[PDB]
């Protein structure tokens, strides 16, 4: 693999509780320092990356509920003030919007009737927040008007806990996945959904949320067990289960256009697998860099795999440190791909700089 990294630093957080999520703020402009947030237990912690591998602790948000367990975080910005924002959620099923400058919760949404596994912001509209829950549904929120735009679930929605979801690059559609082994497509560029988003903006103080009972595509033919991580790779999909492989696939037949796929489409095309080892426990996430040239995944014994996505056989770099032995739950690349951060179950953070 052409990609090479050096481990330049590591630290363990004071509380010693596991770290489950990590996200670099890809909204920061050139000249501003590279910042990442970590989530685990009832804590959200902010760090700044400096020269000579320095990882500088900024501040932490501590939830009054000692029993809250944050599983996810996502960055956005306030379109009116240009200031950054951070959304966090987990076991309590409550979505908190944190001001990262002061690390205080500015507002919260009683998100779901159960735990939230993932949060994602729309790539073009910073106010559109997607939450995925153990209640079998996905919810789309407008954080400018504090409205619930839509609920994706019901009649043909997921039949078990939703574990992951992802918007495609231009934010026209969402692919979700869960414990029912299915991967479901939900178009948000439909006339119904574009109008519902427009309406949530027109709202001013209850807003009537859309109930989307039927996806635009559904498959149970990729994985034979829970699907705990899904990401778009252009018009293709990357998804994983417990079989030590990330499967690259697409709805329909080989030649079929994603935008021409009918909701009743029965076929799937499997293009290949990215194979690895010792990553068969649940809740292990993979990530990509901004340009989607690199794919990263940590395993249960602290190895970090990095694949070069610019292929047709994909070359793989294995990053290891003799002191890194705990399960790597999530990884995050800085926007310029110069830094890769991995977070672990033993509360450790690992910094890998690209050579």
């Amino acid at each position: 693999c052409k990609y090479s990294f050096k481990c330049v630093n590591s630290l363990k957080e004071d509380h010693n509780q596991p770290l489950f999520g990590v996200q670099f703020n890809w909204h920061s402009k050139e000249g501003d320092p590279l910042v990442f947030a970590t989530v685990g237990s009832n804590r959200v912690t902010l760090y700044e990356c400096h020269s000579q591998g320095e990882i500088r602790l900024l501040q932490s948000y501590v939830d009054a509920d000692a029993d809250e367990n944050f599983y996810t975080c996502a960055w956005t910005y306030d379109s009116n003030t240009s200031h950054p924002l951070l959304a966090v959620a987990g076991s309590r099923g409550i979505i908190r919007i944190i001001n990262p400058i002061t690390m205080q919760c500015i507002k919260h949404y009683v998100g779901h009737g159960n735990a939230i596994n993932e949060l994602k912001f729309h790539p073009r509209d910073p106010n559109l927040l997607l939450s995925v829950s153990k209640d079998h549904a996905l919810r789309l929120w407008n954080i400018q008007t504090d409205t619930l735009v839509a609920i994706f679930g019901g009649v043909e929605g997921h039949r078990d806990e939703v574990l992951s979801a992802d918007y495609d690059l231009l934010g026209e559609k969402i692919m979700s996945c869960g414990m029912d082994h299915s991967l479901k497509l939900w178009r948000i560029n439909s006339k119904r959904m574009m109008n519902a988003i427009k309406e949530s903006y027109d709202y001013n103080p209850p807003f009537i949320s859309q109930k989307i009972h039927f996806p635009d595509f559904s498959t149970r033919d990729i994985h034979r067990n829970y699907v705990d991580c899904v990401r778009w790779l252009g018009d293709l999909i990357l998804s994983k289960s417990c079989e030590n492989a990330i499967v690259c696939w697409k709805p329909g037949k080989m030649e079929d256009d994603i935008d021409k796929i009918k909701p009743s489409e029965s076929n799937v095309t499997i293009l290949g697998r990215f194979d690895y080892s010792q990553c068969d426990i649940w809740y292990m996430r993979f990530s990509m860099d901004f340009w989607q040239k690199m794919l990263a995944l940590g395993n249960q014994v602290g190895k970090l795999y990095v694949w070069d996505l610019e292929v047709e056989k994909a070359k793989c770099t294995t990053l290891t440190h003799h002191k890194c032995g705990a399960a790597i739950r999530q990884t995050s690349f800085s926007r310029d791909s110069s830094i890769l951060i991995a977070v672990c179950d033993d509360a450790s953070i690992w910094r890998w700089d690209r050579l």
Partner: peptide
Amino acid sequence: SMFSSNRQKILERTEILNQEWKQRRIQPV
């Protein structure tokens, strides 16, 4: 090719997102 046509879509769409990011001035944390 399948992967080559897919790479061009990634390049074009990430370029659109990068141009939108370049036009923005988000205040530091």
